[PDB]
């Protein structure tokens, strides 16, 4: 009855002993990667920040700098991601994704569609503090169309609270969405954006069900997951997140590994960002929906200490 992650506070935690263990693992010409990944994946993010502070006090060195030169490749990328303070991680990923014409719309869509209003408010505040501009202004400057407008509405974090069901508004909203999809999501965009973006979660779940009976198909089937523009991808992310954030993020992990290549950036981002929120539930949806465990997919597709660390973050195999 609760959302659970795969990383919890290490019991008996001693930040000074852990700092000593990490320094021992790097001091000298060699490296003890196993010690580094076992400790860091078994301490919570808050504990990692206390280790980093004890490390600087004990040794007069910067733990993150040492990790960056001591480790390489995807393993370094994963460890560095785990060290970023949780409160800063989403804001950082958004800022990194906003790069003019090379902007990574997949990341904007993933984070903004799946974070709660409480999470989005924290993100916007943190983002201004770190980067000196508003998240909205950067998003508007680097996106276009009704995709831009939908992100802006979602960024407003003004979604109705879960309240008494109104079957009259359900039917009206479902009809409005059916008509909007019949026009390929290219007409009266402001009207369906208000529905997807500001109605309550429980309300929209009923709307989607009413859409089924009205239309004969599920609302997702109006959008081709592979051959759709940015707005359509966002609507799909919002619909899926309304149904289940763990299921949306599980599907995101699934497509990150399926096919040729591995989208390691997405693999790292989802595992780390969700490790203390809902990664256990993500695993459950992953196994239920894709007939195989997240553990087995990571194991088959990745290598070395990066794989070892990802498997420890995953926590367990599922079947
Ligand atoms: Ca090792
Ligand atoms: Ca893009
Ligand atoms: Ca894109
Ligand atoms: Ca909150
Ligand atoms: Ca149009
Ligand atoms: Ca793969
Ligand atoms: Ca290796
Ligand atoms: Ca089993």
Curated annotation (Swiss-Prot):
Residues of the signal peptide: none
GO cellular component terms given for this protein: collagen-containing extracellular matrix; cytoplasm; cytosol; endothelial microparticle; external side of plasma membrane; extracellular exosome; extracellular region; focal adhesion
Motif interval(s): [IL]-x-C-x-x-[DE] motif: 312-317
Record flagged with keyword Phosphoprotein: yes
Modified residues annotated as Phosphoserine in this record: 35
Post-translational modification: S-nitrosylation is induced by interferon-gamma and oxidatively-modified low-densitity lipoprotein (LDL(ox)) possibly implicating the iNOS-S100A8/9 transnitrosylase complex.
PTM sites of type N6-succinyllysine: 288
N6-acetyllysine: residues bearing it: 68, 74, 77, 95, 99
Chain positions of cross-link Glycyl lysine isopeptide (Lys-Gly) (interchain with G-Cter in SUMO1): 27
InterPro entries: Annexin (IPR001464), Annexin_repeat (IPR018502), Annexin_repeat_CS (IPR018252), Annexin_sf (IPR037104), ANX5 (IPR002392)
GO MF term set: calcium ion binding; calcium-dependent phospholipid binding; phosphatidylserine binding; phospholipase inhibitor activity; phospholipid binding
Keywords: Acetylation, Annexin, Blood coagulation, Calcium, Calcium/phospholipid-binding, Hemostasis, Isopeptide bond, Phosphoprotein, Repeat, S-nitrosylation, Ubl conjugation
Cross-linked residues, Glycyl lysine isopeptide (Lys-Gly) (interchain with G-Cter in SUMO2): 27
UniProt-listed GO biological process terms: blood coagulation; negative regulation of apoptotic process; negative regulation of coagulation; signal transduction
A Pfam short name: Annexin
Oligomeric form and interacting partners: Monomer. Binds ATRX and EIF5B. Interacts with hepatitis B virus (HBV).
Family stated for the protein in its record: Belongs to the annexin family.
Domain remark in the UniProt entry: The [IL]-x-C-x-x-[DE] motif is a proposed target motif for cysteine S-nitrosylation mediated by the iNOS-S100A8/A9 transnitrosylase complex.
Function: This protein is an anticoagulant protein that acts as an indirect inhibitor of the thromboplastin-specific complex, which is involved in the blood coagulation cascade.
Designated name of the protein: Annexin A5
């Amino acid at each position: 009855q609760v959302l659970r992650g795969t990383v919890t506070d290490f019991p008996g935690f001693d930040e000074r002993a852990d700092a000593e263990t990490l320094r021992k693992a790097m001091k000298g010409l060699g490296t003890d990667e196993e010690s580094i990944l076992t400790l860091l994946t078994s301490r919570s993010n808050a504990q990692r920040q206390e280790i980093s502070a004890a490390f600087k006090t004990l040794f007069g060195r910067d733990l993150l700098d040492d990790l960056k030169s001591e480790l390489t490749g995807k393993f370094e990328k994963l460890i560095v991601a785990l060290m970023k303070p949780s409160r800063l991680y989403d804001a950082y990923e958004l800022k990194h994704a906003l790069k003019g014409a090379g902007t990574n719309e997949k990341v904007l869509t993933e984070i903004i569609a799946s974070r709660t209003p409480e999470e989005l408010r924290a993100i916007k505040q943190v983002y201004e503090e770190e980067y000196g501009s508003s998240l909205e202004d950067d998003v508007v400057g680097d996106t276009s169309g009704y995709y831009q407008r939908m992100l802006v509405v979602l960024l407003q974090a003004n979604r109705d609270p879960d309240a008494g069901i109104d079957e009259a508004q359900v039917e009206q909203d479902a009809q409005a969405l059916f008509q909007a999809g019949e026009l390929k999501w290219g007409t009266d965009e402001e009207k369906f954006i208000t529905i997807f973006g500001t109605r309550s979660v429980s309300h929209l779940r009923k709307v989607f069900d009413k859409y089924m009976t009205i239309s004969g198909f599920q609302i997702e089937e109006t959008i081709d997951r592979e051959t759709s523009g940015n707005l359509e991808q966002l609507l799909l992310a919002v619909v899926k997140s309304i149904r289940s954030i763990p299921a949306y993020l599980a599907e995101t992990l699934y497509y990150a590994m399926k096919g040729a290549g591995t989208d390691d950036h997405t693999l790292i981002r989802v595992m780390v960002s969700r490790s203390e929120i809902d990664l256990f539930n993500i695993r459950k949806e992953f196994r239920k929906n894709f007939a195989t465990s997240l553990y087995s997919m990571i194991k088959g597709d990745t290598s070395g200490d990066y794989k070892k660390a990802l498997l420890l973050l995953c926590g367990e195999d599922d079947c």
